[PDB]
Coordinates of C-alpha atoms and ligand atoms in Angstrom, one line a residue:
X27 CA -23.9 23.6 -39.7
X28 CA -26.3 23.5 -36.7
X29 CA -28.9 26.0 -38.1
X30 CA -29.7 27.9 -34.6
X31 CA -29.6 31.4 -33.8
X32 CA -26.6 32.4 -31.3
X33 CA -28.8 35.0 -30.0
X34 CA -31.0 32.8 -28.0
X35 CA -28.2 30.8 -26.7
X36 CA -27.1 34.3 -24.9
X37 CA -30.6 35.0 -24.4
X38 CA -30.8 31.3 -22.7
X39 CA -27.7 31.8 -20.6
X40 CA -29.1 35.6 -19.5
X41 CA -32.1 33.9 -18.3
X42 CA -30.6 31.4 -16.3
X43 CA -28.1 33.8 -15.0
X44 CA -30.3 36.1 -13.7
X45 CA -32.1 33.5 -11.7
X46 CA -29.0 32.8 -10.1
X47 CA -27.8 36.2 -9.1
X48 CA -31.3 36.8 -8.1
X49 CA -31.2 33.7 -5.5
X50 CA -34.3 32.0 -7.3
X51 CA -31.2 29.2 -8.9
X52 CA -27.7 28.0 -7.4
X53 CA -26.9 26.8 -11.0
X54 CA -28.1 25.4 -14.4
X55 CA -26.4 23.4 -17.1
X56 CA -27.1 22.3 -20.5
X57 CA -26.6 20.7 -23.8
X58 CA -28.0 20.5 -27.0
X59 CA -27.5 18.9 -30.4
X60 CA -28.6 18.9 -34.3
X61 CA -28.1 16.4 -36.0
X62 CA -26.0 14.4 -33.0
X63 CA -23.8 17.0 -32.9
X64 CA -23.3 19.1 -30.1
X65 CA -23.1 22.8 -30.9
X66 CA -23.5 24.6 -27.5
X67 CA -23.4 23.8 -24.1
X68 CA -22.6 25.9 -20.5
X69 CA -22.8 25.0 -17.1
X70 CA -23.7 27.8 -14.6
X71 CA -23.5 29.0 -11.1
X72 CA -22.2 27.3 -8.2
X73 CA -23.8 24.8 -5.2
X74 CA -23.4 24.7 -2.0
X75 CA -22.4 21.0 -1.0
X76 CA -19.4 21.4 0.5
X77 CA -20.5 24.6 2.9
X78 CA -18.4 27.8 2.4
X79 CA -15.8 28.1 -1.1
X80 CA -19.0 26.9 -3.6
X81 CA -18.2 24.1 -5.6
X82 CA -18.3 25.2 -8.9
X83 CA -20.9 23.6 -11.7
X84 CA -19.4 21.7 -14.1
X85 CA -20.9 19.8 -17.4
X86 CA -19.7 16.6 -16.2
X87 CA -21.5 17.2 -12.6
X88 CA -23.2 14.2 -11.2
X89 CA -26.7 14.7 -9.7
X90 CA -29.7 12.7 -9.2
X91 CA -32.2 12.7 -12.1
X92 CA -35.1 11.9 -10.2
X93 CA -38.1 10.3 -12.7
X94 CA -35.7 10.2 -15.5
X95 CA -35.0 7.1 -14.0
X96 CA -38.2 5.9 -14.7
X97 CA -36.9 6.3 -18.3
X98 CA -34.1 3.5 -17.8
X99 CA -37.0 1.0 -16.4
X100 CA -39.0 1.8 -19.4
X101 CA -36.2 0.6 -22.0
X102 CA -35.6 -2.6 -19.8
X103 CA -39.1 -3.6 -19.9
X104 CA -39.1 -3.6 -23.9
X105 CA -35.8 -5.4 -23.9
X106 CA -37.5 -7.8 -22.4
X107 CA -40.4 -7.9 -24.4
X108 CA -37.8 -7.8 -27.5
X109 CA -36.3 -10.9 -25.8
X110 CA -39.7 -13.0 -25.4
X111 CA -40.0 -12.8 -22.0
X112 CA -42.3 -10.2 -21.3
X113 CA -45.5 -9.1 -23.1
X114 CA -47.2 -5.5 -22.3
X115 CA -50.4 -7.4 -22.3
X116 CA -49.6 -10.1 -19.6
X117 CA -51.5 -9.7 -16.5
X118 CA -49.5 -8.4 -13.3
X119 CA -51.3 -11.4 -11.4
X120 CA -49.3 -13.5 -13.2
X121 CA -46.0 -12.5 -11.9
X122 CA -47.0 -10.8 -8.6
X123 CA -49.7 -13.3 -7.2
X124 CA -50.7 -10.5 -4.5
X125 CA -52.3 -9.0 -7.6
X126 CA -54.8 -11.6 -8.0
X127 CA -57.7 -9.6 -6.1
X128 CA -60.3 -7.0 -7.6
X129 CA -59.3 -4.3 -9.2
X130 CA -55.3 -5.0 -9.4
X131 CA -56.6 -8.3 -11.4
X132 CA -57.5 -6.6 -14.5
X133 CA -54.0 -4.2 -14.0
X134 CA -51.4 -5.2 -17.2
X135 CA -47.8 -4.2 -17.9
X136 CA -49.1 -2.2 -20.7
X137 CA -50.9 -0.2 -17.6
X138 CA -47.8 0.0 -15.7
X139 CA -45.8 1.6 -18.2
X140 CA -48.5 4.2 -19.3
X141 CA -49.7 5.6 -15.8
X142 CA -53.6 4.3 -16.5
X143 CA -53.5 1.5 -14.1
X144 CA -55.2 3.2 -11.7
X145 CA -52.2 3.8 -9.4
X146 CA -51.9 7.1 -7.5
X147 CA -49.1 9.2 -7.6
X148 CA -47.1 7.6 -4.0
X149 CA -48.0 5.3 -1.2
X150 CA -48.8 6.4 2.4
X151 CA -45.4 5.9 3.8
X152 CA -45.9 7.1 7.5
X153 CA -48.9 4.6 7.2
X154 CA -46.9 1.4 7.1
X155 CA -45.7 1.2 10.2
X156 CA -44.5 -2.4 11.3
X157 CA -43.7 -3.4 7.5
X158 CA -40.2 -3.9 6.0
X159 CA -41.1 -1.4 2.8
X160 CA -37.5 -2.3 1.6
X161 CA -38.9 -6.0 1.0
X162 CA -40.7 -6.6 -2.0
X163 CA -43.4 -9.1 -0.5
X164 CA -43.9 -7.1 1.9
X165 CA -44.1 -3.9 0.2
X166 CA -46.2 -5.2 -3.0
X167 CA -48.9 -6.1 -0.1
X168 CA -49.3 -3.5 1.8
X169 CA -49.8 -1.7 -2.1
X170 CA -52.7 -3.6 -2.4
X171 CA -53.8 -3.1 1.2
X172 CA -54.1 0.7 -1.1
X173 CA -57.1 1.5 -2.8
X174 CA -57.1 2.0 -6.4
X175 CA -57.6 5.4 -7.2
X176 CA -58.9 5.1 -10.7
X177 CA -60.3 2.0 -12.9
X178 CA -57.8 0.6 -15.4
X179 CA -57.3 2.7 -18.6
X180 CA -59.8 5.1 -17.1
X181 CA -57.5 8.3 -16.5
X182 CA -53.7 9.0 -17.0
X183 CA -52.2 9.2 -13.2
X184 CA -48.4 9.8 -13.4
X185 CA -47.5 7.4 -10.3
X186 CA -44.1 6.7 -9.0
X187 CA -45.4 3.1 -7.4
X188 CA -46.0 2.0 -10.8
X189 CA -43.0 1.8 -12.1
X190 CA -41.1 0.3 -8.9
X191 CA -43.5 -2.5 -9.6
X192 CA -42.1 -3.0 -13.2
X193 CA -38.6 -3.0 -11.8
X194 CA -39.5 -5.8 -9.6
X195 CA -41.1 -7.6 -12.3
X196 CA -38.0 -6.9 -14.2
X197 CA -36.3 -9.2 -11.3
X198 CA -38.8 -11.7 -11.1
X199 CA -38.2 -13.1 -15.0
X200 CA -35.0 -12.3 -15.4
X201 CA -33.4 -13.4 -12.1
X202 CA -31.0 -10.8 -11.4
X203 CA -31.6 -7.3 -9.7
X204 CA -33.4 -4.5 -11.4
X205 CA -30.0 -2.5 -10.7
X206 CA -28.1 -5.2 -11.6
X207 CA -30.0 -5.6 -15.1
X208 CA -29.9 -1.5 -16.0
X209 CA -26.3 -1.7 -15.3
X210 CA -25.2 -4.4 -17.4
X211 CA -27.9 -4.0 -20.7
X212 CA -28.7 -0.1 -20.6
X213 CA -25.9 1.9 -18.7
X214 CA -22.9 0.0 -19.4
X215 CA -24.1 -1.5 -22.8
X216 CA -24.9 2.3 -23.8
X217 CA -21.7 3.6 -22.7
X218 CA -22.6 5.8 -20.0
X219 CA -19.4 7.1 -18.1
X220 CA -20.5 8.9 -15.2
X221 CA -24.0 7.1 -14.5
X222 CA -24.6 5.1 -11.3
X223 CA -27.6 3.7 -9.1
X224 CA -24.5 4.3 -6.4
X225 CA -21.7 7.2 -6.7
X226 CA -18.3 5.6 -5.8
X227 CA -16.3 7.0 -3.4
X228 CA -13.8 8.8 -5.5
X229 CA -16.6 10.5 -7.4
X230 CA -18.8 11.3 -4.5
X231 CA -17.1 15.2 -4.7
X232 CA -17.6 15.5 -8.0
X233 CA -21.4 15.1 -6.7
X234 CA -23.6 18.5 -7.0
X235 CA -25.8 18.5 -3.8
X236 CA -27.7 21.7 -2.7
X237 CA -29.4 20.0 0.7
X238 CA -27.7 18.0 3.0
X239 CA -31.0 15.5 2.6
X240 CA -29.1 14.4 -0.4
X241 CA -25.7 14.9 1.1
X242 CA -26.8 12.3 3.4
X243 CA -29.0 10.5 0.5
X244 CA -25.4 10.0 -1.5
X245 CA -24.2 7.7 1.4
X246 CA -27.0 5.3 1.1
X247 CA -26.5 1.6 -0.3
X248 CA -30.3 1.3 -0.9
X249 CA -33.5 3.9 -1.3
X250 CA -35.1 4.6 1.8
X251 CA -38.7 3.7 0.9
X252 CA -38.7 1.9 -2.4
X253 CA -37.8 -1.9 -2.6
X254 CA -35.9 -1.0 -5.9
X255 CA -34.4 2.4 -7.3
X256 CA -36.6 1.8 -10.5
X257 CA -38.7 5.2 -10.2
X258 CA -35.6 7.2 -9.1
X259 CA -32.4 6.7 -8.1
X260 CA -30.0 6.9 -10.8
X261 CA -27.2 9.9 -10.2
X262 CA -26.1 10.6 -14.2
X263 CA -24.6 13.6 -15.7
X264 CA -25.7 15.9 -19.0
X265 CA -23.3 13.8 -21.5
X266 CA -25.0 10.9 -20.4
X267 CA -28.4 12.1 -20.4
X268 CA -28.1 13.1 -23.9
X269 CA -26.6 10.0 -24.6
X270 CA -29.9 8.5 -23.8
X271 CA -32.4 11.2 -25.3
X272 CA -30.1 10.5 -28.3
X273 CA -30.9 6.8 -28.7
X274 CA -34.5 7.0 -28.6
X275 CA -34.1 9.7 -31.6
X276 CA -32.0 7.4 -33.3
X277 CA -34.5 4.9 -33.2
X278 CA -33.0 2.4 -30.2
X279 CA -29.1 2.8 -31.3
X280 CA -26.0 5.3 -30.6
X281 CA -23.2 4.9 -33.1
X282 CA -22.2 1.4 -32.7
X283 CA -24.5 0.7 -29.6
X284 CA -27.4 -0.5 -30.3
X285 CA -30.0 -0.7 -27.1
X286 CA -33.7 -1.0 -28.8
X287 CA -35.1 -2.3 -32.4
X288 CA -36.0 0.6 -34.4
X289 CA -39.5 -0.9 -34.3
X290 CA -39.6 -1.4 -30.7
X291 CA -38.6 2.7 -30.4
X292 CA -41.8 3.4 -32.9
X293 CA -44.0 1.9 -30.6
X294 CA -42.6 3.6 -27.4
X295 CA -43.1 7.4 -29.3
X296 CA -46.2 6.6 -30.1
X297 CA -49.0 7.7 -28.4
X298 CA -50.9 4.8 -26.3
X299 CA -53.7 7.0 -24.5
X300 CA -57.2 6.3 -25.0
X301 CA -58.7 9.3 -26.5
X302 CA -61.0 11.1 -24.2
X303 CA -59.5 9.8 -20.9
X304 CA -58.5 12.6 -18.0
X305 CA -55.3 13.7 -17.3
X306 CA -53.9 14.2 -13.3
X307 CA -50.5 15.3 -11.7
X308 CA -50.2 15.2 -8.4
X309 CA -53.4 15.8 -6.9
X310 CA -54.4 18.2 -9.6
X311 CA -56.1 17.7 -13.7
X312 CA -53.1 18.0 -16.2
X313 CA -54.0 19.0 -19.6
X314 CA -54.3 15.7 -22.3
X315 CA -51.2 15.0 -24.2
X316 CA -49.7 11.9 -25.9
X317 CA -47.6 9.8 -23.5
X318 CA -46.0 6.3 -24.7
X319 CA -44.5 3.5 -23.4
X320 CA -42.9 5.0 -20.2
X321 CA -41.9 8.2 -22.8
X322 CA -44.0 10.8 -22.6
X323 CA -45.2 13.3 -25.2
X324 CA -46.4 16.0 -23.6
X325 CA -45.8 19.1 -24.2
X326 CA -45.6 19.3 -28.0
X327 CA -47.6 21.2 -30.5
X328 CA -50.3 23.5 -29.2
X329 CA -49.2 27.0 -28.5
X330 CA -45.2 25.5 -27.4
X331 CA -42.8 25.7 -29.8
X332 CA -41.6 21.8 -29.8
X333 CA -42.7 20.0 -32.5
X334 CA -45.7 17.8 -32.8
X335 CA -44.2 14.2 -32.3
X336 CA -41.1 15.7 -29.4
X337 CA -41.0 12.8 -26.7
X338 CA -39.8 14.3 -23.2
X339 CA -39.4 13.3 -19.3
X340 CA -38.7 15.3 -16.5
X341 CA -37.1 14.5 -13.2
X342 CA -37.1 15.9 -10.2
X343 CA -34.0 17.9 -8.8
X344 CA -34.8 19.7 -10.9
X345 CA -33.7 18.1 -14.7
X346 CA -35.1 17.2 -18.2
X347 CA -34.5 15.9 -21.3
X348 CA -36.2 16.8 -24.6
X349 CA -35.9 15.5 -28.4
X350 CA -37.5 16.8 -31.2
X351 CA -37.1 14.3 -34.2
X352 CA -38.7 17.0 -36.6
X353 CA -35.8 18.5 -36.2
X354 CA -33.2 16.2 -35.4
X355 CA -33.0 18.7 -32.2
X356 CA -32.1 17.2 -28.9
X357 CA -31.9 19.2 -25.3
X358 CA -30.9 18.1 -22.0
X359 CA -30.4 20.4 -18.7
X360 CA -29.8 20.5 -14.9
X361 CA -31.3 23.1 -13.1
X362 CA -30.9 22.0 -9.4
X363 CA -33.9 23.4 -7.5
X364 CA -35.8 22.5 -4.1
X365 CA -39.3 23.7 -5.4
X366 CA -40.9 23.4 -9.0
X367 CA -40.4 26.8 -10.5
X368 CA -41.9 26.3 -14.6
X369 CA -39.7 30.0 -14.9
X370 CA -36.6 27.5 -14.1
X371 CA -38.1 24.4 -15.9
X372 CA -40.5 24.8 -18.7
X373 CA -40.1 28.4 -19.7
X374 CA -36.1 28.0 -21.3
X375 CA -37.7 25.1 -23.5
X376 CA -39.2 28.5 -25.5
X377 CA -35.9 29.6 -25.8
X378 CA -34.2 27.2 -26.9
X379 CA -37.1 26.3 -29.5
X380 CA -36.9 29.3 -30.5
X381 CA -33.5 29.8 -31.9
X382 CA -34.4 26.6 -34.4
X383 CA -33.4 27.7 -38.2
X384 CA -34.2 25.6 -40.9
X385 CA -31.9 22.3 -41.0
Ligands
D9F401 C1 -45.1 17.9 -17.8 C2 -45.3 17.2 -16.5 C3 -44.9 18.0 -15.3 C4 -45.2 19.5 -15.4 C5 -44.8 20.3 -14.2 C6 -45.8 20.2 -13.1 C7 -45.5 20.1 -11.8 C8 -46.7 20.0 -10.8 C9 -46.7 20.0 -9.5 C10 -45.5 20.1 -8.6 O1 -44.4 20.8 -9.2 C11 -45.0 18.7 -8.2 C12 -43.5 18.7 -7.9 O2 -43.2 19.6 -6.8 C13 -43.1 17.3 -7.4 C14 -44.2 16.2 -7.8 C15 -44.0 15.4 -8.8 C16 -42.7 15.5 -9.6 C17 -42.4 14.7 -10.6 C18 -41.1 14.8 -11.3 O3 -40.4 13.6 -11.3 C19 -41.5 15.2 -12.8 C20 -42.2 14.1 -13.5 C21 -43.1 14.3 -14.5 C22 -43.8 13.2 -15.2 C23 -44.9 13.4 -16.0 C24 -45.4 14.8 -16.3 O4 -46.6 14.9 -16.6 O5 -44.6 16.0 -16.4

């Protein structure tokens, strides 16, 4: 029925085992699908957020999923623009008059949600001292106290500031909160159980948490440097996660729920990067890949294994989603991690690629 070969799913679950009895991983968990179906999943390991007797990892674990988040903020934008009140094309000046100056004058939505506005990656935060960065005035102008790094659609720069600018343009033209906006159209409308921009109380256990500087980050009613939680935030689970990478391969709807136009999904997985333009992460040149709106397409084809046309996002924590339409192949995991290790991150997604039969 699912058309995948058993022996990479014990080759899958070898590999992330022997991370974790090497110390290199406290615990993994995954799920993936053919066809919307669920044929395998296995959670991993233990974590240490309750000190000694190590909390076990579950598939219905809550954890942050860092940049993923950025994923919610994308779909809420083209709700909007599905509703008439936004257009990609409409200058930020227009909505955040301390835009109206050189360089952020020429910056559009359609920027935003593609990295090439010229935004770094973060904002000097031990540089702002004296400013409320938990205001949005405030925090918008001491953004463009910043220098641009780059020109407008002249290089692909994944920033974080970016889109905690879109969630507060989300605010301005809808007049509710960004949170309260993703909870109401997106999370709840979706159906996500166990996905929150704050954990209650009675669920704050089921938390995993392998530093205390997110034991301490679980407590919190607000984030500690961003004016929204539109970049990252969002605590969420596998189920849910899937959920989500499920709908955009669906073409905007789950079942019964229906989130995005099957149109307005074509135009997200498509690519919207100039041809020629240069690629950065973080300081360093990334190699060019197709990147939509907020969805990013990259990697795919080449020497990997996905398919040419598999839309992807990764999240810090560490945590991933990837959906390969080709083969109506969808795969979602938690690997809780402090440092980037692509042996923990990228190198499974050969695995799991790899056990693929013919649908
Ligand atoms: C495919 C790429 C990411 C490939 C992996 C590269 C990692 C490079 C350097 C260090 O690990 C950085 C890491 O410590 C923390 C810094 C940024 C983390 C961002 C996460 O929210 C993942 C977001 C990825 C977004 C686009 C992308 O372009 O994803």
């Amino acid at each position: 029925n699912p058309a995948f070969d058993m022996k990479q799913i014990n080759a899958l679950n070898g590999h992330y085992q022997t991370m974790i009895d090497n110390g290199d991983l406290q615990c993994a968990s995954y799920m993936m699908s053919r066809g919307g179906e669920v044929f395998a999943a296995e959670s991993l390991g233990e974590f240490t957020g309750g000190q000694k007797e190590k909390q076990t990892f579950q598939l219905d674990t809550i954890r942050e999923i860092g940049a993923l988040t950025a994923v919610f903020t994308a779909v809420a934008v083209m709700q909007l623009v599905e509703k008439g009140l936004l257009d990609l094309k409409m200058p930020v000046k227009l909505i955040l008059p301390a835009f109206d100056k050189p360089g952020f004058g020429e910056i559009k939505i359609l920027h935003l949600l593609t990295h090439t506005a010229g935004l770094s990656f973060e904002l000097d935060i031990q540089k702002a001292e004296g400013i409320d960065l938990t205001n949005e005035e405030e925090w918008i102008n001491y953004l463009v106290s910043t220098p641009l790094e780059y020109g407008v659609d002249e290089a692909w720069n994944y920033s974080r500031t970016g889109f905690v600018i879109l969630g507060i343009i989300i605010s301005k033209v809808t007049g509710v909160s960004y949170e309260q906006y993703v909870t109401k159209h997106i999370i709840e409308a979706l159906g996500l159980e166990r996905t929150y921009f704050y954990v209650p109380d009675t669920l704050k256990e089921e938390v995993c948490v392998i530093s205390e500087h997110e034991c301490v980050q679980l407590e919190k009613s607000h984030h500690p440097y961003f004016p929204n939680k539109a970049t990252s935030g969002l605590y969420s689970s596998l189920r849910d996660i899937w959920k989500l990478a499920e709908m955009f391969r669906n073409k905007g709807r789950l079942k019964d729920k229906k989130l995005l136009g099957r149109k307005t999904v074509e135009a997200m997985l498509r690519n919207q990067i100039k041809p020629g333009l240069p690629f950065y992460f973080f300081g360093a040149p990334r190699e060019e890949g197709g990147f939509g709106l907020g969805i990013n397409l990259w990697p795919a084809g080449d020497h990997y294994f996905m398919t040419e046309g598999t839309f992807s996002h990764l999240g810090m924590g560490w945590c991933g989603m990837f959906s390969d339409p080709a083969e109506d192949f969808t795969y979602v995991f938690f690997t809780p991690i402090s440092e980037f290790h692509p042996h923990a991150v990228l190198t499974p997604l050969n695995i799991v690629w790899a056990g693929i039969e013919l649908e």
